Amino acid sequence: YAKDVKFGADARALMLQGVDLLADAVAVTMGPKGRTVIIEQSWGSPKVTKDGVTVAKSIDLKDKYKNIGAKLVQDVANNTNEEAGDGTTTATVLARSIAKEGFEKISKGANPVEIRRGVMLAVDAVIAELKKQSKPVTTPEEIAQVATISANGDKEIGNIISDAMKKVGRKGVITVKDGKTLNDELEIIEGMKFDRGYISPYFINTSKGQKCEFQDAYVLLSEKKISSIQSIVPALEIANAHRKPLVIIAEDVDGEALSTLVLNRLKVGLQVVAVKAPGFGDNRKNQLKDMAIATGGAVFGEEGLTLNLEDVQPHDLGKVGEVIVTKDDAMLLKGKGDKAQIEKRIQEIIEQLDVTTSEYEKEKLNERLAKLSDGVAVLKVGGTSDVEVNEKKDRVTDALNATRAAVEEGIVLGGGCALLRCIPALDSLTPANEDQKIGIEIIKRTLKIPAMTIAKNAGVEGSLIVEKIMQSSSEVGYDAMAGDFVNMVEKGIIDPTKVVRTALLDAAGVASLLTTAEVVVTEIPKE
Amino acid sequence: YAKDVKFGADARALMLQGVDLLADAVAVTMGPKGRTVIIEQSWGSPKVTKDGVTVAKSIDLKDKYKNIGAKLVQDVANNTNEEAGDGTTTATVLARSIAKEGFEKISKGANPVEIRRGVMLAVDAVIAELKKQSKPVTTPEEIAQVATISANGDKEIGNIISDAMKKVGRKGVITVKDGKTLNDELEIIEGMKFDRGYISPYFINTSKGQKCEFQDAYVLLSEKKISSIQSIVPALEIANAHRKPLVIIAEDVDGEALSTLVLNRLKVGLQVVAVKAPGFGDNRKNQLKDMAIATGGAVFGEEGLTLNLEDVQPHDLGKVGEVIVTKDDAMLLKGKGDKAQIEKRIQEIIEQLDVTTSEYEKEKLNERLAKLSDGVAVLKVGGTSDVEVNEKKDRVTDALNATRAAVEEGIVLGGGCALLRCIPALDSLTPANEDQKIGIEIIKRTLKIPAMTIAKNAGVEGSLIVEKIMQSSSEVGYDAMAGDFVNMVEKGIIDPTKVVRTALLDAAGVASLLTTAEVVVTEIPKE
Amino acid sequence: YAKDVKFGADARALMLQGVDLLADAVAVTMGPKGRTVIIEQSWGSPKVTKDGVTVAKSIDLKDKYKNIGAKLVQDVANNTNEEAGDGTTTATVLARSIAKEGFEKISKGANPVEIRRGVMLAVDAVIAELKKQSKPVTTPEEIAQVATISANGDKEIGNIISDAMKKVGRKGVITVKDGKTLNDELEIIEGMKFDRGYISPYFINTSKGQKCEFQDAYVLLSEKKISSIQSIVPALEIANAHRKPLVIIAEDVDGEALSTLVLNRLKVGLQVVAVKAPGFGDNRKNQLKDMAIATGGAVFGEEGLTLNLEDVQPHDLGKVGEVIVTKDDAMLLKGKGDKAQIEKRIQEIIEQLDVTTSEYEKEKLNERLAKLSDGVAVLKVGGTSDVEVNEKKDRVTDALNATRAAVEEGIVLGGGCALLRCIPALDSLTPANEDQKIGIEIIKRTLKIPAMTIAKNAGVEGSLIVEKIMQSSSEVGYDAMAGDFVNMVEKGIIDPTKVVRTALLDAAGVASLLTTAEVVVTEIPKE
Ligand SMILES: Nc1ncnc2c1ncn2[C@@H]1O[C@H](COP(=O)(O)OP(=O)(O)OP(=O)(O)O)[C@@H](O)[C@H]1O
Ligand SMILES: Nc1ncnc2c1ncn2[C@@H]1O[C@H](COP(=O)(O)OP(=O)(O)OP(=O)(O)O)[C@@H](O)[C@H]1O
Ligand SMILES: Nc1ncnc2c1ncn2[C@@H]1O[C@H](COP(=O)(O)OP(=O)(O)OP(=O)(O)O)[C@@H](O)[C@H]1O
Ligand SMILES: [K+]
Ligand SMILES: [K+]
Ligand SMILES: [K+]
């Protein structure tokens, strides 16, 4: 395939136009007075978003040379999402500023490799200073403030997130789902949800709602399918002797066992129910064992130390204070497993979690941890239309990510005030020569851009706001929503350290290396 | 397919334009002040590179007649990579210089075949003089200097490479892998890594990390799959009699043996573990025998002298002081094989290595040598993005190649100073007639180009630098990074002989033969 | 398909332009100062060649009417290659000269059929005179001179070819193969090479190189596969009784026989080896019988006079003084077959060679002859690149062809001096009428062209050189490389008769018949 090659200033010029166009497109969404973007979809209704990384990833340009810069800065935003999930617009504005200035600063005498090296040194100093500036999290009021900021100032969302974190712990499982109502709702899930329904309608004993409700039931856990009359009779005999209900959790129930169970239940009122085993593969076995410890029962049919169904004993069955079964799910509430083994299981699970990490295994392990310890919370997001629901869940997910991050790390000043306060640290650096001298001064001049961009999106002159803020004491900042100068901490306009430091480091490294180009090669367009 | 034919001066002119364009494109990356090139990729993010051969192989032009010269000089660079892996830009600059001058020198009276013959004679003299100039390697400081030069002046990379060579020997196995961290790290691998995990989770005995840790274990090596209770019982009986742990390395474990092993381990605490055999085909057998000598054990089931599992004896099992097994790998640390047989095995392996050579077999043999003698080192290259990681591993691989080459051969002056010092040798040649007289003078005028190119990339006039250097004493040279005249040896700016001599010989031979063209034929472009 | 038809002078004109263009393209490569041609390849690197027939076959033109002449004269060159493999440029220059003059000589009154008849008579006289001029070959110095001429003056190639002919005889087998080194090498193959490796690594007895080396071994030749223990035991018993090594050459070895052999070798040190039979089909049988006579053994399992393995006798096994077996090949050096049967076999083979001829059967028969009598020589051609290696093997193959031809026939003056000296013979012819008078004068004027072309390629005026040569005594000629007049025989610039006579006859007949055209029909180009 034939290709075209361009050299030097023209290539840099097209590079910078492409970067500027993409970054201008993304920048409109930033801050409390930013606006949303709609992206056309070829198969239905277009999404409406205020998400920088979404905008960046959604834009590709026909012009080949602009396309390099476009794809690189969309990747920068994508990396920001990959790591923090937020801060992406800040990363983008930093990237455009540094790339632009570098392109208009490069000269015959400059040496980009030392320039970038000095950039790396200065940014490392910046993150060091930020880490020294960080403060721990202590109050639910602070978490709620962070959540409100991340949710674009939605106090109801912030309150719901704070309540959820209180209920499920700061490391609990929170999931977002579409609502069918005008208002958002917080639903708390306790115990064990495993999405298996009743096997036979005959087992229903509660008319209102067609529910199976039993008290003080025996628990039978079978890893393998239950088939034989000889395998089933001893357990039912034990249950009838003790006059207690029985719940049978098994891989499957075969025709003969199912017919016997339903027929006996119909003709005697025998309190029995059967349900499918949850999870597939080794996951099924994991849940079965976890339930065994939780209820104080045993798992029958294990490959190691195989325990036979023919000789089931009364002490091998778990005990649960309440069981609720419906068409979609089944519930055991008050297991009777011993606390010491429960603690052993939780400890081993967290150790397994700490050894090897992947998205699937971490998700399953976290789900198990919550199920075994505290439960999970699901926030259902309501709305009149799919586009509106999507637009709000975007902000809700951003808020959740931000709150989790502010749980892992400390806080810094929001609104760019932390970055503005970081300028004195760069004045202590001593460059060995001109290339890093240029790098440090560039960083000292670029780190300020977010505040100007925020003020511009607010319709005020960022230069005047930043000058008054930097001339003010460290505890004073500018609230862009009110349009005033205030002490930021009492208003609660604060940001997590990790997001900003990651965005700065990634954007600076990537774009600063980009600024070393002299020649660009692209394929000639085909017919 | 219809084709077009052109004759003489026009064909040569287009040839030289194509060569010049490609070589100009490649030359920007050369030397300490060279810059990087980005190459568009049709399936994702574009690579950023400073690699001459990569640039050359990545460029193809639409114009048919330029394309001949383009492909020939990319091949020249490719040959340089095929042999040295470095020096490719130097080879390219030599090729362009000689090709250009030849094209603008050819005349009715010239006879290219004697011209090229004289070129070959003179270059042979040049390599002879270089080989006389070469000096052996003696110090880790010199190796570190070479590594730093090849890594584009990265002292951290040079230090890490020097430490790696110290740990694994000058002929050890070093591999490059992607990092997940901001900084590079050096990891040392001792013993035998074979990438097989534990067969059964039941065998785990260490809670923290889910590891199998055993001391003074017996080693069972089975080439074939282990199936029968009769085949397994004697070994477990021996192990229990001697009250020592057992590790079973076998092709596979069947259902009955696996169930018996896991059940016994669970019910008694019997110290047993089983793992898959590593390697496939005859490679598996090779590792099994090598482990047999290493541990002092025997291999059961061999086709020759078949040894039965039914009559296993205590002395047929290897002994190892420590074994560590985890999900991904297993480790035996302190084998008890006899040193004389270990030495016999290493000797036979190196003899096999010396008989027949191919990339796969050499790789496997080197891996075995390191595993049996000293181990292997892996350098993990960190970074914030795939493009950055790729760009740095390129330089790291170049550096590794350069250090290996400087281990095989001697050193010469870097920066082109060796080639500049080679001019007096050509003044001793006596040509028989005009065609070789022209060839020798051409070589004497072209060998100087690298220094001018280095100075030009440094932004200084190569003619003045080269003149002052050649007017200076032999031990004085110009450091392009500082921009000064210095004694090169103390600064450590030195180059391996092989790379330069190979690049010179290949470039001269190929392009000098190319300079014999009069007519070029290409196919007419299709619609 | 619609077609276009043209008549007379226009058709002849386009015919001659096409012939002239193609011939001009080819002519640049001729003689000691000719240059090379590069031909574009659509799948990789273009070949570089100095070969007239290659150039001619590689050229096709879009213009339909030129294409007839182009294809006809490429065919002429191809015929020259088909017969001689050299002389192709001379044939082409003769063809263009005669075709051109004929086209510009044809007139209303000329009768081309008698013109061509006279051409045929005169050329027949020319070959008669050449055959009278021919002289036998007597000295290795003369063969070396011929080889040097054909190799474009390469004395190293000429020396290597002369040494090869000395080692393997003037009718031995010589093959060309790619080298992996900078220099060419001559390798001599004696005995029997059949490209089969050892069946089992267990049979290896020499550590250095992993070779099977045995002395005074028995030879077992089995046409069919060896399977049964009953079939194998008697031979091994005989070998152990006589305490001599055994080599088993068989179609294949089955699992049981292979296991027994390897196990016995391992446990006793029994000197046995097994190898695959070489050749497929009846070729396998031919080699097996030939080895039977060579070693004095017998072939077991033949369809006629089937000899059983169960009753093998000590005298049925061949004897060989030394056997070397490695991974790729096996060698028996000093067979003990009776000379009278060896001579009978060689005689029958050469008689079979003389009865029926095809390329495959002749190749196999010649290979067998060399293997049974003297062995074969392989010249390995070195070089830095595939294109260079190809360019040199082309000349080497040309040289081999030329030396073989000069072994079959005599010699004449090179440089066209023989053809120049042939002019007096045509002055004795008496034409019956004008058409053959024209034919004879045309031939007398065209036969001189090669010398002018040689001088033109040398950059001197061929007319003056030819005039001085023809004015000189018969033993004096012009060396174009030095540019002087010399006695050709002492310098050794001489040519084989067959190549020149064949080229002249084919070119004259074909083009002279071509010169009888009046109308040309071609298809109208499609869309
Ligand atoms: N009312 C406010 N007053 C002052 N600063 C504010 C106010 N509201 C938000 N900010 C600041 O806006 C910045 C975040 O804006 P935004 O979320 O649009 O940028 P981003 O995180 O880069 O974009 P994205 O969410 O797509 O990654 C924070 O620094 C925050 O402190
Ligand atoms: N600071 C320096 N002063 C003087 N010479 C230097 C300096 N740094 C590097 N050089 C010289 O640059 C030359 C190598 O440059 P470079 O690696 O770009 O060329 P190349 O090896 O042909 O390219 P490639 O790595 O793609 O094969 C060496 O001769 C080296 O001595
Ligand atoms: N140094 C020389 N002096 C005089 N004549 C020479 C000299 N070298 C070669 N020749 C003559 O050149 C002629 C052969 O040239 P060349 O091989 O190029 O023609 P060709 O055989 O028709 O081409 P091809 O090899 O493609 O078939 C011979 O007649 C040879 O005697
Ligand atoms: K935003
Ligand atoms: K380079
Ligand atoms: K020729």
Numbering used by the authors:
A (entry chain Y), B (entry chain N), C (entry chain H): 0 to 526
Which sentences did the original study use to describe this structure?
Functionally, as a group I chaperonin in mitochondria, mtHsp60 forms a complex with the cochaperonin mtHsp10 (gene name: HSPE1) and serves as folding machinery by facilitating the proper folding of unfolded proteins. Because of its abundance and functional role, the mtHsp60-Hsp10 complex is considered as a crucial factor to mitigate folding stress.
To characterize the detailed in situ structural properties of the mtHsp60-Hsp10 complex under folding stress, we performed subtomogram averaging using particles extracted from stressed mitochondria. We focused primarily on the football conformation, as the half-football and bullet-like conformations were present at low abundance, yielding poorly resolved reconstructions. The structure exhibits the classical features of a football shaped group I double-ring chaperonin: 14 mtHsp60 subunits arranged in two stacked rings of seven each, capped by a heptameric mtHsp10 (10, 11, 28). The in situ structures closely resemble a previously reported in vitro cryo-EM structure of a purified mtHsp60 complex in a similar football-shaped arrangement. Our analysis suggests that, in situ, the ATP-binding sites in the Hsp60-Hsp10 complex are not fully occupied, with ~12 of the 14 nucleotide-binding pockets showing evidence of occupancy, which indicates that fully occupied nucleotide is not necessary for its function and formation of football complex. With the fitted model, we identified the extra density as potential salt bridges between residues Lys103 and Glu107, as well as Arg444 and Glu460. In addition, we observed extra density at the base of the chamber, primarily located in the region of the unstructured C-terminal tails (residues 523 to 547) of mtHsp60 subunits, which displays connectivity to the substrate density. Notably, folding stress led to a significant increase in the proportion of the football conformation. These results suggest that under folding stress, the mtHsp60-Hsp10 complex increases its proportion of the football conformation as a structural response to elevated levels of unfolded proteins, thereby enhancing its folding capacity.
